[PDB]
Design a protein around this ligand. Structure first.
Ligand SMILES: CCn1cncc1Cn1c(CN2CCC(c3cccc(OCc4ccc(F)cc4F)n3)CC2)nc2ccc(C(=O)O)cc21
Length: 382
Protein backbone atom coordinates (compact mmCIF):
# COMPACT_ATOMS: atom_id res chain seq x y z
CA UNK A 1 0.00 0.00 0.00
CA UNK A 2 1.89 3.01 -1.35
CA UNK A 3 1.96 5.48 -4.23
CA UNK A 4 2.16 2.56 -6.68
CA UNK A 5 -1.41 1.43 -6.12
CA UNK A 6 -2.35 5.11 -6.18
CA UNK A 7 -1.01 5.48 -9.72
CA UNK A 8 -2.79 2.28 -10.73
CA UNK A 9 -6.14 3.29 -9.26
CA UNK A 10 -5.71 6.70 -10.87
CA UNK A 11 -5.19 5.03 -14.24
CA UNK A 12 -8.41 3.06 -13.78
CA UNK A 13 -10.24 6.20 -12.66
CA UNK A 14 -9.07 8.02 -15.78
CA UNK A 15 -10.07 5.03 -17.90
CA UNK A 16 -13.59 5.23 -16.49
CA UNK A 17 -14.17 8.99 -16.21
CA UNK A 18 -12.93 9.41 -19.78
CA UNK A 19 -15.66 7.19 -21.20
CA UNK A 20 -18.06 8.88 -18.78
CA UNK A 21 -17.27 12.43 -19.88
CA UNK A 22 -17.53 10.89 -23.34
CA UNK A 23 -21.07 9.52 -22.94
CA UNK A 24 -22.48 11.80 -20.24
CA UNK A 25 -25.94 13.35 -20.83
CA UNK A 26 -25.77 16.44 -23.05
CA UNK A 27 -27.54 19.63 -21.91
CA UNK A 28 -29.61 22.09 -23.98
CA UNK A 29 -28.19 25.62 -23.74
CA UNK A 30 -24.91 27.35 -22.98
CA UNK A 31 -25.88 28.77 -19.56
CA UNK A 32 -24.28 25.65 -18.03
CA UNK A 33 -20.53 25.07 -18.01
CA UNK A 34 -18.73 22.39 -20.02
CA UNK A 35 -17.27 19.02 -18.97
CA UNK A 36 -13.54 18.67 -18.32
CA UNK A 37 -10.92 16.70 -16.40
CA UNK A 38 -8.08 18.35 -14.48
CA UNK A 39 -5.96 15.40 -13.32
CA UNK A 40 -7.68 15.80 -9.95
CA UNK A 41 -11.40 15.37 -10.72
CA UNK A 42 -13.30 14.37 -13.87
CA UNK A 43 -15.30 17.63 -13.96
CA UNK A 44 -18.69 17.07 -15.62
CA UNK A 45 -21.36 19.63 -16.46
CA UNK A 46 -22.68 21.82 -13.66
CA UNK A 47 -25.01 24.73 -13.07
CA UNK A 48 -23.38 28.12 -12.40
CA UNK A 49 -23.90 30.26 -9.32
CA UNK A 50 -23.12 27.29 -7.08
CA UNK A 51 -20.33 24.95 -6.22
CA UNK A 52 -20.86 21.20 -6.08
CA UNK A 53 -19.62 19.53 -2.91
CA UNK A 54 -18.82 16.34 -4.81
CA UNK A 55 -16.50 13.70 -3.42
CA UNK A 56 -12.88 14.29 -4.30
CA UNK A 57 -11.84 11.18 -6.26
CA UNK A 58 -11.61 7.85 -4.49
CA UNK A 59 -8.15 7.00 -5.83
CA UNK A 60 -6.56 9.18 -3.16
CA UNK A 61 -4.59 7.13 -0.60
CA UNK A 62 -6.64 8.77 2.15
CA UNK A 63 -9.95 8.63 0.28
CA UNK A 64 -10.29 5.08 1.60
CA UNK A 65 -10.27 6.80 5.01
CA UNK A 66 -12.63 9.64 4.05
CA UNK A 67 -16.10 9.42 2.48
CA UNK A 68 -16.47 13.17 2.99
CA UNK A 69 -14.11 14.45 0.32
CA UNK A 70 -15.40 17.73 -1.08
CA UNK A 71 -13.80 19.68 -3.93
CA UNK A 72 -15.63 22.66 -5.39
CA UNK A 73 -15.73 24.80 -8.52
CA UNK A 74 -17.65 28.05 -9.16
CA UNK A 75 -18.78 28.17 -12.77
CA UNK A 76 -19.39 31.87 -13.30
CA UNK A 77 -22.78 32.42 -14.93
CA UNK A 78 -20.84 35.11 -16.80
CA UNK A 79 -18.45 32.47 -18.13
CA UNK A 80 -15.96 29.82 -17.01
CA UNK A 81 -15.26 28.32 -13.60
CA UNK A 82 -13.48 30.27 -10.86
CA UNK A 83 -9.90 31.52 -10.73
CA UNK A 84 -8.23 32.57 -7.48
CA UNK A 85 -8.23 36.16 -6.21
CA UNK A 86 -6.30 38.26 -8.79
CA UNK A 87 -4.70 35.13 -10.33
CA UNK A 88 -5.41 33.70 -13.79
CA UNK A 89 -5.24 29.93 -13.21
CA UNK A 90 -8.44 27.98 -12.48
CA UNK A 91 -9.37 27.80 -8.81
CA UNK A 92 -9.89 24.61 -6.81
CA UNK A 93 -10.12 23.43 -3.21
CA UNK A 94 -8.78 20.66 -0.99
CA UNK A 95 -9.85 21.93 2.43
CA UNK A 96 -11.03 18.66 3.93
CA UNK A 97 -9.75 15.57 2.08
CA UNK A 98 -6.04 16.20 2.64
CA UNK A 99 -3.83 13.97 4.79
CA UNK A 100 6.58 7.80 10.73
CA UNK A 101 8.93 6.99 7.82
CA UNK A 102 6.37 5.37 5.48
CA UNK A 103 8.58 4.14 2.64
CA UNK A 104 11.96 5.89 2.93
CA UNK A 105 13.04 2.30 3.58
CA UNK A 106 12.72 1.77 -0.16
CA UNK A 107 15.18 4.44 -1.26
CA UNK A 108 17.68 3.85 1.54
CA UNK A 109 17.93 0.16 0.74
CA UNK A 110 17.96 0.87 -2.97
CA UNK A 111 21.18 2.76 -2.40
CA UNK A 112 22.30 0.05 0.02
CA UNK A 113 22.21 -2.55 -2.73
CA UNK A 114 23.38 -0.43 -5.65
CA UNK A 115 26.60 0.18 -3.73
CA UNK A 116 26.94 -3.58 -3.38
CA UNK A 117 26.38 -4.34 -7.04
CA UNK A 118 28.92 -1.62 -7.83
CA UNK A 119 31.53 -3.31 -5.67
CA UNK A 120 30.72 -6.71 -7.18
CA UNK A 121 31.01 -5.45 -10.76
CA UNK A 122 34.35 -3.88 -9.83
CA UNK A 123 35.73 -7.05 -8.23
CA UNK A 124 34.57 -9.76 -10.63
CA UNK A 125 35.96 -7.97 -13.68
CA UNK A 126 39.45 -7.88 -12.15
CA UNK A 127 39.13 -11.52 -11.11
CA UNK A 128 38.36 -12.35 -14.74
CA UNK A 129 41.14 -10.10 -16.02
CA UNK A 130 43.56 -12.23 -14.03
CA UNK A 131 42.36 -15.51 -15.54
CA UNK A 132 42.19 -14.37 -19.22
CA UNK A 133 45.69 -15.24 -20.38
CA UNK A 134 47.97 -13.47 -17.93
CA UNK A 135 48.08 -16.23 -15.38
CA UNK A 136 48.15 -18.41 -18.54
CA UNK A 137 47.56 -21.44 -16.28
CA UNK A 138 43.89 -22.01 -17.09
CA UNK A 139 42.51 -25.54 -16.87
CA UNK A 140 38.93 -26.50 -17.69
CA UNK A 141 37.78 -25.76 -14.14
CA UNK A 142 39.32 -22.32 -14.69
CA UNK A 143 37.38 -22.04 -17.94
CA UNK A 144 34.07 -22.86 -16.28
CA UNK A 145 34.76 -20.30 -13.55
CA UNK A 146 35.78 -17.62 -16.04
CA UNK A 147 32.50 -18.19 -17.83
CA UNK A 148 30.53 -18.20 -14.58
CA UNK A 149 31.78 -14.69 -13.86
CA UNK A 150 30.04 -13.41 -17.00
CA UNK A 151 26.73 -14.34 -15.38
CA UNK A 152 27.23 -12.00 -12.43
CA UNK A 153 28.60 -9.39 -14.83
CA UNK A 154 25.46 -9.38 -16.96
CA UNK A 155 23.19 -9.56 -13.91
CA UNK A 156 24.65 -6.39 -12.41
CA UNK A 157 24.65 -4.77 -15.85
CA UNK A 158 20.95 -5.50 -16.25
CA UNK A 159 20.00 -4.24 -12.79
CA UNK A 160 21.86 -1.00 -13.42
CA UNK A 161 20.26 -0.50 -16.83
CA UNK A 162 16.84 -1.17 -15.33
CA UNK A 163 17.10 1.29 -12.44
CA UNK A 164 18.53 3.87 -14.83
CA UNK A 165 16.05 3.64 -17.70
CA UNK A 166 13.13 3.60 -15.28
CA UNK A 167 14.48 6.81 -13.74
CA UNK A 168 12.37 5.93 -10.72
CA UNK A 169 14.81 6.84 -7.96
CA UNK A 170 13.96 10.53 -7.79
CA UNK A 171 10.26 10.62 -8.71
CA UNK A 172 9.42 8.60 -5.60
CA UNK A 173 7.81 11.65 -3.97
CA UNK A 174 5.93 13.05 -6.97
CA UNK A 175 3.22 14.59 -4.83
CA UNK A 176 1.70 16.60 -7.67
CA UNK A 177 -0.25 14.77 -10.35
CA UNK A 178 2.34 14.84 -13.11
CA UNK A 179 1.86 11.12 -13.69
CA UNK A 180 1.19 11.43 -17.44
CA UNK A 181 4.61 10.43 -18.71
CA UNK A 182 4.99 7.82 -15.97
CA UNK A 183 2.14 5.80 -17.43
CA UNK A 184 3.35 6.85 -20.87
CA UNK A 185 6.67 5.22 -20.02
CA UNK A 186 4.90 1.98 -19.10
CA UNK A 187 4.04 1.59 -22.77
CA UNK A 188 5.34 -1.35 -24.78
CA UNK A 189 8.33 0.57 -26.17
CA UNK A 190 11.02 -0.11 -23.57
CA UNK A 191 9.75 -1.53 -20.25
CA UNK A 192 9.02 -4.72 -22.20
CA UNK A 193 12.47 -5.40 -23.64
CA UNK A 194 14.42 -4.11 -20.63
CA UNK A 195 12.41 -6.20 -18.18
CA UNK A 196 12.66 -9.30 -20.37
CA UNK A 197 16.41 -8.69 -20.49
CA UNK A 198 16.75 -8.46 -16.73
CA UNK A 199 14.71 -11.66 -16.48
CA UNK A 200 16.84 -13.61 -18.94
CA UNK A 201 20.04 -12.46 -17.26
CA UNK A 202 18.88 -13.32 -13.76
CA UNK A 203 17.84 -16.75 -15.04
CA UNK A 204 21.11 -17.50 -16.82
CA UNK A 205 22.81 -16.48 -13.59
CA UNK A 206 21.18 -19.44 -11.85
CA UNK A 207 21.63 -21.92 -14.67
CA UNK A 208 25.34 -21.18 -14.72
CA UNK A 209 25.61 -21.98 -11.03
CA UNK A 210 23.75 -25.18 -11.89
CA UNK A 211 26.08 -26.23 -14.68
CA UNK A 212 29.00 -25.41 -12.40
CA UNK A 213 27.59 -27.77 -9.79
CA UNK A 214 27.06 -30.42 -12.45
CA UNK A 215 30.66 -30.13 -13.57
CA UNK A 216 31.87 -30.31 -9.99
CA UNK A 217 29.88 -33.53 -9.75
CA UNK A 218 30.72 -35.31 -13.02
CA UNK A 219 34.40 -34.73 -12.25
CA UNK A 220 34.08 -36.44 -8.88
CA UNK A 221 31.64 -39.34 -9.24
CA UNK A 222 31.11 -40.24 -12.91
CA UNK A 223 34.92 -40.31 -13.15
CA UNK A 224 34.88 -39.76 -16.93
CA UNK A 225 34.83 -36.75 -19.24
CA UNK A 226 34.96 -38.02 -22.82
CA UNK A 227 36.55 -35.02 -24.56
CA UNK A 228 35.93 -31.32 -24.96
CA UNK A 229 32.47 -32.73 -25.84
CA UNK A 230 31.34 -32.38 -22.22
CA UNK A 231 32.27 -28.69 -22.23
CA UNK A 232 30.61 -28.21 -25.61
CA UNK A 233 27.47 -29.49 -23.89
CA UNK A 234 27.93 -27.42 -20.74
CA UNK A 235 28.49 -23.98 -22.24
CA UNK A 236 25.68 -24.78 -24.66
CA UNK A 237 23.18 -25.40 -21.87
CA UNK A 238 24.61 -22.39 -20.07
CA UNK A 239 23.17 -19.50 -22.06
CA UNK A 240 20.86 -21.67 -24.16
CA UNK A 241 18.47 -23.26 -21.69
CA UNK A 242 17.27 -20.04 -19.98
CA UNK A 243 16.49 -18.58 -23.39
CA UNK A 244 14.29 -21.62 -24.02
CA UNK A 245 11.61 -20.69 -21.50
CA UNK A 246 11.55 -16.88 -21.56
CA UNK A 247 10.85 -16.30 -25.25
CA UNK A 248 7.71 -18.39 -24.72
CA UNK A 249 6.93 -16.06 -21.81
CA UNK A 250 7.10 -13.26 -24.34
CA UNK A 251 4.84 -15.16 -26.73
CA UNK A 252 2.46 -15.22 -23.79
CA UNK A 253 2.59 -11.61 -22.72
CA UNK A 254 3.07 -9.54 -25.88
CA UNK A 255 -0.06 -10.89 -27.57
CA UNK A 256 -1.92 -11.90 -24.40
CA UNK A 257 -1.90 -8.76 -22.22
CA UNK A 258 -2.52 -5.19 -23.38
CA UNK A 259 -1.09 -1.89 -22.08
CA UNK A 260 0.63 -1.90 -18.71
CA UNK A 261 4.14 -3.15 -17.99
CA UNK A 262 2.96 -6.49 -16.81
CA UNK A 263 4.75 -6.40 -13.41
CA UNK A 264 3.72 -9.98 -12.58
CA UNK A 265 -0.05 -10.04 -12.74
CA UNK A 266 -2.89 -10.57 -15.14
CA UNK A 267 -5.32 -11.80 -12.45
CA UNK A 268 -4.65 -15.28 -13.85
CA UNK A 269 -1.25 -15.98 -12.22
CA UNK A 270 0.72 -16.00 -15.49
CA UNK A 271 4.08 -15.68 -13.69
CA UNK A 272 5.18 -19.32 -13.55
CA UNK A 273 6.68 -19.88 -17.00
CA UNK A 274 9.79 -18.00 -15.88
CA UNK A 275 10.05 -18.68 -12.15
CA UNK A 276 9.35 -22.43 -12.06
CA UNK A 277 12.64 -23.46 -13.74
CA UNK A 278 14.51 -21.06 -11.45
CA UNK A 279 13.26 -23.02 -8.44
CA UNK A 280 14.12 -26.19 -10.37
CA UNK A 281 17.74 -25.08 -10.80
CA UNK A 282 17.93 -23.95 -7.17
CA UNK A 283 16.83 -27.38 -6.00
CA UNK A 284 19.39 -29.10 -8.20
CA UNK A 285 22.26 -26.91 -6.98
CA UNK A 286 21.18 -27.42 -3.38
CA UNK A 287 21.24 -31.20 -3.68
CA UNK A 288 24.66 -31.02 -5.35
CA UNK A 289 25.89 -28.93 -2.43
CA UNK A 290 24.74 -31.61 -0.02
CA UNK A 291 26.47 -34.42 -1.91
CA UNK A 292 29.69 -32.42 -2.17
CA UNK A 293 29.75 -31.63 1.54
CA UNK A 294 29.32 -35.36 2.14
CA UNK A 295 32.20 -36.23 -0.20
CA UNK A 296 34.50 -33.67 1.39
CA UNK A 297 33.73 -34.57 4.99
CA UNK A 298 34.42 -38.17 4.05
CA UNK A 299 37.78 -37.51 2.38
CA UNK A 300 38.73 -35.42 5.41
CA UNK A 301 38.39 -38.44 7.67
CA UNK A 302 42.11 -39.27 7.55
CA UNK A 303 45.31 -39.10 9.64
CA UNK A 304 37.80 -32.17 17.31
CA UNK A 305 40.02 -30.84 14.53
CA UNK A 306 37.36 -31.58 11.90
CA UNK A 307 34.54 -29.07 12.31
CA UNK A 308 36.88 -26.14 12.95
CA UNK A 309 38.57 -26.91 9.63
CA UNK A 310 35.34 -27.95 7.89
CA UNK A 311 34.04 -24.40 8.31
CA UNK A 312 36.81 -22.83 6.24
CA UNK A 313 35.65 -25.15 3.45
CA UNK A 314 31.87 -24.97 3.60
CA UNK A 315 32.05 -21.17 3.83
CA UNK A 316 34.13 -21.20 0.66
CA UNK A 317 31.58 -23.43 -1.02
CA UNK A 318 28.39 -21.45 -0.28
CA UNK A 319 29.05 -18.55 -2.70
CA UNK A 320 30.32 -20.94 -5.37
CA UNK A 321 26.91 -22.58 -5.67
CA UNK A 322 23.74 -20.64 -4.88
CA UNK A 323 23.11 -22.17 -1.47
CA UNK A 324 22.33 -18.68 -0.16
CA UNK A 325 19.46 -18.17 -2.61
CA UNK A 326 17.38 -21.03 -1.20
CA UNK A 327 16.75 -19.15 2.04
CA UNK A 328 15.42 -16.10 0.20
CA UNK A 329 13.26 -18.29 -2.03
CA UNK A 330 11.90 -19.83 1.18
CA UNK A 331 11.18 -16.48 2.88
CA UNK A 332 10.35 -13.95 0.15
CA UNK A 333 7.92 -15.87 -2.07
CA UNK A 334 4.25 -14.93 -2.05
CA UNK A 335 1.31 -15.67 -4.34
CA UNK A 336 0.70 -11.94 -4.83
CA UNK A 337 2.55 -8.85 -5.99
CA UNK A 338 2.40 -5.29 -4.67
CA UNK A 339 4.48 -2.90 -2.62
CA UNK A 340 5.22 -5.79 -0.28
CA UNK A 341 6.62 -7.61 -3.31
CA UNK A 342 8.98 -4.73 -4.08
CA UNK A 343 10.10 -4.30 -0.47
CA UNK A 344 10.75 -8.00 0.11
CA UNK A 345 12.38 -8.51 -3.28
CA UNK A 346 14.65 -5.55 -2.67
CA UNK A 347 15.73 -6.82 0.75
CA UNK A 348 16.58 -10.07 -1.02
CA UNK A 349 18.42 -8.19 -3.74
CA UNK A 350 20.32 -6.29 -1.04
CA UNK A 351 21.68 -9.28 0.86
CA UNK A 352 22.31 -10.87 -2.56
CA UNK A 353 24.20 -7.95 -4.10
CA UNK A 354 27.26 -8.87 -2.04
CA UNK A 355 27.75 -12.46 -3.14
CA UNK A 356 29.20 -11.15 -6.35
CA UNK A 357 32.14 -9.87 -4.32
CA UNK A 358 32.49 -13.05 -2.29
CA UNK A 359 32.94 -15.38 -5.26
CA UNK A 360 35.53 -13.14 -6.90
CA UNK A 361 37.58 -12.64 -3.76
CA UNK A 362 37.40 -16.31 -2.72
CA UNK A 363 38.13 -18.02 -6.04
CA UNK A 364 40.75 -15.72 -7.57
CA UNK A 365 42.44 -13.85 -4.68
CA UNK A 366 43.02 -16.29 -1.80
CA UNK A 367 43.92 -19.69 -3.21
CA UNK A 368 47.57 -20.68 -3.42
CA UNK A 369 47.98 -20.49 -7.19
CA UNK A 370 46.63 -16.97 -7.68
CA UNK A 371 48.96 -15.56 -5.05
CA UNK A 372 51.79 -17.61 -6.55
CA UNK A 373 51.30 -15.80 -9.85
CA UNK A 374 52.48 -12.51 -8.35
CA UNK A 375 54.89 -14.31 -6.02
CA UNK A 376 56.72 -15.49 -9.13
CA UNK A 377 56.22 -12.58 -11.56
CA UNK A 378 57.56 -9.90 -9.21
CA UNK A 379 60.62 -12.18 -9.35
CA UNK A 380 60.87 -11.36 -13.06
CA UNK A 381 59.97 -7.67 -13.14
CA UNK A 382 62.18 -6.30 -10.32
C1 LIG B 1 11.24 -3.11 -13.82
C2 LIG B 1 9.80 -3.54 -13.76
N1 LIG B 1 8.92 -2.43 -13.39
C3 LIG B 1 8.51 -1.41 -14.18
N2 LIG B 1 7.72 -0.57 -13.56
C4 LIG B 1 7.60 -1.07 -12.28
C5 LIG B 1 8.34 -2.22 -12.15
C6 LIG B 1 8.48 -3.03 -10.90
N3 LIG B 1 9.85 -3.44 -10.63
C7 LIG B 1 10.96 -2.65 -10.46
C8 LIG B 1 10.94 -1.17 -10.56
N4 LIG B 1 10.11 -0.51 -9.56
C9 LIG B 1 9.70 0.81 -10.03
C10 LIG B 1 8.76 1.47 -9.04
C11 LIG B 1 9.43 1.63 -7.68
C12 LIG B 1 8.44 2.20 -6.70
C13 LIG B 1 7.94 1.47 -5.64
C14 LIG B 1 6.94 2.02 -4.87
C15 LIG B 1 6.45 3.28 -5.16
C16 LIG B 1 7.03 3.94 -6.23
O1 LIG B 1 6.52 5.16 -6.52
C17 LIG B 1 7.11 5.88 -7.61
C18 LIG B 1 6.80 5.25 -8.93
C19 LIG B 1 5.62 5.59 -9.60
C20 LIG B 1 5.52 5.50 -10.97
C21 LIG B 1 6.60 5.05 -11.67
F1 LIG B 1 6.50 4.96 -13.02
C22 LIG B 1 7.78 4.70 -11.08
C23 LIG B 1 7.84 4.81 -9.72
F2 LIG B 1 9.00 4.49 -9.10
N5 LIG B 1 8.00 3.44 -6.98
C24 LIG B 1 9.95 0.27 -7.22
C25 LIG B 1 10.84 -0.36 -8.29
N6 LIG B 1 12.06 -3.35 -10.25
C26 LIG B 1 11.65 -4.68 -10.29
C27 LIG B 1 12.39 -5.85 -10.17
C28 LIG B 1 11.75 -7.07 -10.27
C29 LIG B 1 10.37 -7.14 -10.49
C30 LIG B 1 9.70 -8.46 -10.57
O2 LIG B 1 8.41 -8.41 -10.78
O3 LIG B 1 10.32 -9.50 -10.44
C31 LIG B 1 9.62 -5.97 -10.62
C32 LIG B 1 10.28 -4.76 -10.52
Amino acid sequence: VSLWETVQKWREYRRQCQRSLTEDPPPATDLFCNRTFDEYACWPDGEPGSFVNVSCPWYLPWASSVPQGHVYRFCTAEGLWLQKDNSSLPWRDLSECEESSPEEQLLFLYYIYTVGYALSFSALVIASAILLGFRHLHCTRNYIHLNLFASFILRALSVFIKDAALKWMYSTRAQQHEWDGLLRYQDSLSCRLVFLLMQYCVAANYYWLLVEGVYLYTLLAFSVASEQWIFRLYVSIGWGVPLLFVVPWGIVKYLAEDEGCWTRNSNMNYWLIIRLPILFAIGVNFLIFVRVICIVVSKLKANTDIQCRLAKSTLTLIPLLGTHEVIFAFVMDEHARGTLRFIKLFTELSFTSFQGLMVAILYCFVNNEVQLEFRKSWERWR
